[PDB]
Amino acid sequence: TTQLIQQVSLTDFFRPDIEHAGSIVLILRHPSDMIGEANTLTQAGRDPDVLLEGLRNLFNACTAPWTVGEGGGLRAYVTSLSFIAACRAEEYTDKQAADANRTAIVSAYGCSRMETRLIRFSECLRAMVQCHVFPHRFISFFGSLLEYTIQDNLCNITAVAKGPQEAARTDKTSTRRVTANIPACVFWDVDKDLHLSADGLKHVFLVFVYTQRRQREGVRLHLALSQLNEQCFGRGIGFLLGRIRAENAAWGTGDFRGLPTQLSCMYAAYTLIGTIPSESVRYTRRMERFGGYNVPTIWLEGVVWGGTNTWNECYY
Amino acid sequence: AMPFEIEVLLPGELSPAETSALQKCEGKIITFSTLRHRASLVDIALSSYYINGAPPDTLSLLEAYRMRFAAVITRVIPGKLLAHAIGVGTPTPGLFIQNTSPVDLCNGDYICLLPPVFGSADSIRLDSVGLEIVFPLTIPQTLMREIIAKVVARAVERTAAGADVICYNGRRYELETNLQHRDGSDAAIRTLVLNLMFSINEGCLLLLALIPTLLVQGAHDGYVNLLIQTANCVRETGQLINIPPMPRIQDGHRRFPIYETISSWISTSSRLGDTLGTRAILRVCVFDGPSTVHPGDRTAVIQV
Amino acid sequence: AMPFEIEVLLPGELSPAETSALQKCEGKIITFSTLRHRASLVDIALSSYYINGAPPDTLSLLEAYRMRFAAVITRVIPGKLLAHAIGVGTPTPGLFIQNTSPVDLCNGDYICLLPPVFGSADSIRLDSVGLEIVFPLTIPQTLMREIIAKVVARAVERTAAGADVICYNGRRYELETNLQHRDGSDAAIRTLVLNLMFSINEGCLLLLALIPTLLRFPIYETISSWISTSSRLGDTLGTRAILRVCVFDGPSTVHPGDRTAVIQV
Amino acid sequence: ELAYVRDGVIQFEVQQPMIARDGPHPVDQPVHNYMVKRIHKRSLSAAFAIASEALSLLSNTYVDGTEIDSSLRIRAIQQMARNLRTVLDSFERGTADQLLGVLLEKAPPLSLLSPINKFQPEGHLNRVARAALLSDLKRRVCADMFFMTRHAREPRLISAYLSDMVSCTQPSVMVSRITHTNTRGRQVDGVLVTTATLKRQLLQGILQIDDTAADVPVTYGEMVLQGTNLVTALVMGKAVRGMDDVARHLLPVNARVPADLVIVGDKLVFLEALERRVYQATRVAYPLIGNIDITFIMPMGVFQANSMDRYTRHAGDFSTVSEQDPRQFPPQGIFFYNKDGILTQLTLRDAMGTICHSS
Amino acid sequence: ELAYVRDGVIQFEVQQPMIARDGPHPVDQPVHNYMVKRIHKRSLSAAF
Amino acid sequence: RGMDDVARHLLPVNARVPADLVIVGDKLVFLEALERRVYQATRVAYPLIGNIDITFIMPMGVFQANSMDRY
Amino acid sequence: MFFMTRHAREPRLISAYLSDMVSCTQPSVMVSRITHTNTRGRQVDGVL
Amino acid sequence: MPHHPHWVNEHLTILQFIAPSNPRLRFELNPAFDFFVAPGDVDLPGPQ
Amino acid sequence: SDRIAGLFNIPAGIIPTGNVLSTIEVCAHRCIFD
Amino acid sequence: SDRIAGLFNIPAGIIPTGNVLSTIEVCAHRCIFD
Amino acid sequence: TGFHPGIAFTVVRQDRFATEQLLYAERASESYFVGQIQVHHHDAIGGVNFTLTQPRAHVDLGVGYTAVCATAALRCPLTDMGNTAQNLFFSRGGVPMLHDNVTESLRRITASGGRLNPTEPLPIFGGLRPATSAGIARGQASVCEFVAMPVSTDLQYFRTACNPRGRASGMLYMGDRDADIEAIMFDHTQSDVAYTDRATLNPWASQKHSYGDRLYNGTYNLTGASPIYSPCFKFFTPAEVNTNCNTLDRLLMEAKAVASQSSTDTEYQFKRPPGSTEMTQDPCGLFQEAYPPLCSSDAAMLRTAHAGETGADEVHLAQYLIRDASPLRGCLPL
Amino acid sequence: VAYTDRATLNPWASQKHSYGDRLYNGTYNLTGASPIYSPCFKFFTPAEVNTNCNTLDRLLMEAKAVASQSSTDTEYQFKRPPGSTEMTQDPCGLFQEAYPPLCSSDAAMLRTAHAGETGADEVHLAQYLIRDASPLRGCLPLPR
After folding, report:
1. G/A Cβ contact: 3+ pairs below 8 Å
2. Neighboring chains of I (3 or more beta-carbon pairs < 8 A)
3. SS3 category, K146
4. Where are the beta strands (DSSP E) in chain K?
5. If DSSP codes are grouped into helix, strand and coil, which group holds residue D302?
6. Of the candidates B30, B121, B22, B146, which has an alpha carbon nearest to the alpha carbon of residue B76?
7. Domain of life, per the record (chain E) (predicted)?
């Protein structure tokens, strides 16, 4: 009635001893693909060696720098959503919760050189959106954390990939079940902002936001929760993001050199990941502890994870 | 698990020889603005589709279908009406619909749904409470694309100045559309011209600089002689509009210009027929029953 | 709920070469026209894809892989085959697969089918009954658009007369195949390239035919012509995924020519 | 079998008397009537849940040998039993709720049924009598809208009001059976459903209590649908209630329960407020606290077209020290009183949003 | 032994009734409450 | 508190004293005033003599800003 | 506010107050032990 | 000047000068002062 | 500090000591408890 | 129309009077019936 | 600028009150049938969510009437009876202006006057809702409205229960035949049914295709895109009934439990939602007559010389007072 | 919210950083070292208790026993000393409301021409009288 998934990865970008069960985990592609992809996808008059520098200087100071590539076997596979949130905490509108998230995750992990790893990751994302290799194409939704096993610098995660959330029996402290929860800085419910506010079915989307203005890149992601379907959801946010759309469309015989394109006019991309087939969605913003620090979260209820991870783009 | 069921409570004031008609409308599709476990009969009638005061029309009914949750009626007990949702992500063990199109359905086809545009309505009118329910036509995808092309073409031509047949399997069908609400039509034209816009990059020059070369590669093969039929834009451009020689591909050592162009067109192409019409929601799969589907019959379908 | 156990009765008179080569071709994918618990071999073979009384090209195969019903060849006893419906709702418990593509499936990617667009078609000729069977490649969805755009664009320069790596999972892959296979793929791609160019060409021109300040002749019979041709061609390419590589306690990475388990979307 | 009935009906058959008369008139005749009524169908509903980790315990899977889980199973069983008892009582409460709901949506106002009833002679009134009737009703509805706040102090009018209200409704039927009666064998005539405030106000000095406990039946009705009626319901689609008696025609226990019994006019009736026993501590509004809508109009800016009518009461009222009296200018506003009792104002430029529209 | 207490606590739990209704209304389920109070410490004084 | 009692479920003389009982409404309550038995003759105020604070407001120097208002 | 002095000349304008004042609260808890009663078995409900 | 200056409007009434739509209200903050929008960094009469 | 809960499991000690004689919508008086 | 099937139940269930003798495909004659 | 533009108006606002009714019923008034309970379960959040249902049936066992209700008390009023003027620009009307730059001027000016006005950037889901305020104080706001009428229509018509159209209309007056019900409202060659000295008191608001009728009649549907309520609807749209020729005295069966015409939980008066089961009482729209409250043109005619009185003083020097003849004579502070 | 047709009766005290706000609101501490009590404090200064996101009606929980605000034994109204514990009742401090007492701009407008009677006569020739609506409309010694 459910479906689990397993993955062994390193623990540099994620530590399951610190995230609680129900947190969303994200999967990464190999960084080596970015090289060739930027090699033929970068815009004319722009050198992708800045992307090269970003990644290279990132992976020079994250973990064992060697064997991060091809012929080793192991890799930095999974990352927490809270992690990718808190290294870009300088663009989320509700500043105070995001700032608490950032300081908590900077203090809760290894304690040494994470300030380093965070800005490395921020700079890397900035560079990729600058060379027209978008992050949404490399980061996918893995599952919701259920149970783990760790060792010296290596982890073993088992997560829910399909079906109802509360049908997964786990052996933790309090109760055999667990519910999903997200950091309160990435939560972005569209019903208030479009004034629909109706009970019933609600999808959960995973939406990125792109602001590519020269030397002023911007990448942030939220977890949408709307009544709209996957068809008209693009119309909805394209609507309440009008200024960003304008900025990007502007600052991104005869010929066609110097025209509006797709790579230059893109601002957001989203995916469908689940459903909430309840009578009314209730969710509680309660302040919670990550070990020694307190950060606010969203506690959802009755989310049935979905699938078919196809990204819907928005340049119009 | 179990499929997301929908029960709607039929009000008491219904004569016997109207539920008689209702007991025949199984296998037909209805749609709900919101997906709750309970609903009322007035939430699926046409009066819920009113745009503002007035009954809507095609250029708006299409919009409505793609922003509304669909569902299929299975059985109609006395005093209730059960139905299963479609595209939410729940399984259905055995699903059956009724062909309401005027055309015949093959096997393995995808199904989009289209408002009554052939000008023939089998809608049931419940005069007791004074309501009326219209059901969307279930149509194969290819016919969907043809009809939607005709409709948007008539939309653009209809609002130029000075204020309809389709062949399929060897039969002509006379469609007719009502283009009221001049504003609702322009929304489509914005999407038309816009999707038209983002389909041009720097690569389009070279694919234009070889059009006369296609005129010669087509003068020798049969099928290519068909794609250059005596009535098409590219044909007339091959004899009137010339192309300047290609200026050298700037930054052409690492970046390939044609590649991004053709990859960028794949995006809009998959989106065009979806945003102007509707997405394919059902896929006919007759396990053992007769292969083709006549108007009025009933067959099994899976969710796609 | 019960699975849909298809069986294809292998006849006799199959040389031990063909039986010994079929017994390995399990976990691959076949497509019928209709779904029956009791089918034959001709319904699988290339003869079912004769569109205009001739073996098809890449475009016809692309069209067919959408209007048919896929299946997976499970265990093969010496007498007959055993396949399971894959698209329709079925709870199939084993449902493993074998990766037939020169790229590595990572644990967690979704899979969509693709005809042998590049290179030769890896098949098995059963010369005892006079028929061959081709198998669709299985690739992660991340590359579905990239590989198509890369194969078709290259065919344009070879169409351009008169005067490329696909790196996935951090592993390169070329396309020239160490030899000159510029010919062989021209016969089986040519219809596709034509239908693409005559669509993107009339797209740049109809717009410049609407308002001249962008930067005899019915234009409304022209608009209807472009939108239908473009919309009915695009939706063929834009596949959807039907499997997902879910791996337990095995190797997270799948190499070409290896086995792995999956789930139905 | 109430889920099967396509429709059920009841029948009445009433005869009116006649009076012999002399000319010049039409010679009257006996008149017969024939009515046939249908029934409405309504349903009730209630629900409750058993979340996970409670289903994985009652269904004795994931069983374990210890006792710390038998305890939890006991706990979940107790939760289930409690929820079940509550959802079973909810039907008993909702029954009375829906009964009030049916009664309220049927009863016409009193401010019409009382005057109309006095004008029954010549059951079909002609035109002029109808006009006079309308003219009377128009005053009546405005003169007694809130009769219990306008005369809260004078109870001898409220008593007559109650004696009138409980009279203008004709009795329903006489179905021979044990009835709700007093302690001394008086057949209670009806009920008077109020609110807590109005009840406590009525028991003070307007009405006279008579009893504290009545004797009511404690058994439901009964229908079985077996016998020849079953055949007639299966072959054809109709069945009669007392078929086994229609054939031959051709060819009970009490209980002392507490309540308040009052004499109003000349009928011993009940007086119940259902805001405490039921409707308390649930998300359910009381159906007797209803709404009402009243429309107000005020002419704004009118100027009296005459010379006589623009006058003063005496000479020198509201006189201004200034030379020209600013009052003989055409008024351009209007003043009235808010809900809170504050002086607002409605000028002309408030009509700009309505007269300057393109329409 | 009150001078030995660090903090005391008392617990409440009430369950409210419900009313079965008809559409259109969300089907009602019971509700349960769980409140918890604490005690405040005070003293008195007297001299001579 | 009731440990020995929760464990089992987990598997006097009076005096006639003078007072002033009144029946307000449909309830029966006491009626006391402690100022004479308890608080009298000590240096402690009877805590039922409590204070209240109200804010007053007045306009100083306004002029009727119209021609109709002055009459 | 001062409904005990301003309405001193109308006594029955106050019994309506106190008859309602002692009603707008909720009885707390029935602890299993004899309580204060009157000389005829009836129970007291509070203090004023 | 492309638009109408703000300091010039005196045809109003007290019932209009208060309305939330007057873009001059935000600068009426002191009985003895006059706040206005002025250019920056031109202290003296300065250049034309 | 909200640590009162968990001093003891909130449902526990099944046998009560008293009986709340008032059924009221307690959700309205949330701010009276801890 | 065809209210005639509404005068009785379709499979009434009473014991039949007799039984037919011709087992030809009746579907071809569905016009001489009401 | 205070210049009277030679035209008068008639205000119409609709307030709402929460009252305490009273119901009587006769012994054995309903035959009540109870069916049998059935249980059908579906899925829950991980668990199960049962549901119990039970069918029932009832029928009025009386020959004449059996039960009767009446409004008895008055709780707090629900809508403040203030001055919240409407706005027509909420509506996607028909024939627009010619220069888009004067339409914007009109809208800007008229939005400078009131607080009920649409937001500027037209949203896409729903229609042109008003700005959501931060706090609401006295209750839901009532939407005062205006109908144009000449400046000299005498006042003697506005001192008692009357009709905003200036021509008493409706069905209650005559129902002998069918086509009469139409002529009574619109035929202006027949004298008015109530004031038989004149055809009408207001030409600009009571004639077919006139100003006001084209402005309000629900047939023509001018304010169809606006969510705002409009009280003149039931006074302008002609009522139609299926039994217009069958029933003789439907006065009762038309004025018992009419369903709401608006909402009750919005900071303004909006049109009714599709799914509101609220049920009210309407004595006003039954006779098609309104009631005048205590109003006056001079604010100093509402005050008297000593200790809380109401200064009737009917008229004085071209300024009028209209002593109220409402149903709510007392039971209201001042 | 009070008189919806306007924005504010007095722009010189209401708006942020205005004159009255500057002089009376306590967040600026200007009148900090002054021993003299200041009634306008409770009106100008925005209240704040951490039960913002936690109550429907903490009206009852914030309108019961507010401590005293002014001294109790000084000839003048000094601010309450820190060593004080006297508690009182502040109704008007909850609703942010005041009360107009019987007052006028002309002393002769109060008295009536005969036998100890108070006259209202609200307005007369640019000089006004405000008949009161305080709680203490009676119970207060008039001249006669």
Report:
1. no
2. D, E, F, G, L
3. strand
4. 8-26, 30-34, 38-39, 42-43, 48-60, 67-77, 79-85, 140-144, 146-149, 295-296, 321-322
5. coil
6. B22
7. Viruses
Residues of chain K with C-beta less than 8 angstroms from the C-beta of L1:
133, 135-138
Task: Work out whether strand K30-34 and strand K48-60 pair parallel, antiparallel, or are unpaired.
Answer: antiparallel
Method: cryo-EM
Does L15 contact chain H (CB < 8 Å)?
yes
Q: What tokens does C177 get?
A: 């195949």
Q: Report DSSP letters for L63-90, one per residue.
A: SS-PBP-B-SSSSS-BBPPTT---B-B-
* Chain I CA closest to residue L51: I31
Other chains touching G, judged by 3 or more CB pairs under 8 Å: F, I, L
Nearest-Å Rg of the Cα atoms of chain K is 24
**From the CA of K125, how many Å to the nearest CA of chain A?**
7
Is the Cα torsion angle G15, G16, G19, G24 positive or negative in sign? negative
Among the listed residues B266, C150, C239, B246, the one whose alpha carbon sits nearest the alpha carbon of residue A41: C150
Task: Give the separation between CA D218 and CA D212, rounded to whole angstroms.
Answer: 18
What's the rounded Cα separation, in Å, for the pair E35 and L79? 40
The label of the residue with tokens 């000068």 reads H17
Beta bridge partners of A157: A7, A148
Q: Nearest residue of F to residue I13 by CA position?
A: F6
Overall size of chain C counted in residues: 265
Interface contact B213, partner E, CB < 8 A? no
Query: HEC states along chain C?
Result: CCCCEEEEECCCCCCHHHHHHHCCCCCCEEEECCCCCEECCCCCCHHHHCCCCCCCCHHHHHHHHHHCEEEEECCCCCCECCEEECCCCCCCCCCEEECCCCCCEECCCEEEEECCCCCCCCEEECCCCCCEEECCEEEEHHHHHHHHHHHHHHHHHCCCCCCCCCCECCECCCCCCCCCCCCCCCCCCHHHHHHHHHHHHHHHHHHHCCCHHHCCCCCHHHHHHHHHHHHHHHHHHCCCCCEEECCCCCCCEECCCCEEEEEEC
Chains touching E (at least 3 CB pairs under 8 A) are: B, D, I, K
Q: What does DSSP say about strands C5-8 and C38-39: parallel, antiparallel, or unpaired? A: parallel
Task: Say if CB A14 and CB A80 are below 8 A apart.
Answer: yes
CA of I12 to nearest chain F CA: how many angstroms apart? Answer: 9
Asked if C58 and C106 touch (Cβ cutoff 8 Å), the reply is no
Position D181, amino acid: T
Q: Do G30 and I21 touch (CB under 8 A)?
A: yes
Sign, CA torsion D196/D197/D199/D203: positive
CA dist A291 and C38 (Å) reads: 61
Helix/strand/coil for K109: helix
CA distances from B273 to B190, D310, G29 (A): 14, 74, 70
Q: State how far residue L26 is from chain H, nearest Cα, in angstroms.
A: 18
Instruction: Measure E33 CA to nearest chain I CA, in Å.
Output: 8
- Resolution of the solved structure (Å): 5.3
- Categorise residue D352: left if φ over 0, alpha if ψ from -120 to 50, beta otherwise: alpha
Rounded CA separation A47/B254 (Å): 10
Are residues A192 and A207 in contact, defined by beta-carbon separation less than 8 angstroms? no
> Are E17 and D282 within 8 A, CB to CB?
yes
- DSSP structural state of residue D26: P
Residues from chain K that touch D150, judged by Cβ atoms under 8 A, are 330-331
**CB within 8 Å of chain K, chain B residues 20-79:** 37, 40, 42-43, 48, 52-54, 79
Q: Which residues of chain L have a CB within 8 Å of the CB of K307?
A: 120, 131
F30 close to G (CB below 8 A): yes
List residues in chain F that are followed by a break over 2.5 Å (C to N).
11
Alpha helices per DSSP H over B83-227 = 141-158, 182-197, 204-209, 211-218, 222-227
The full length of chain D comes to 359
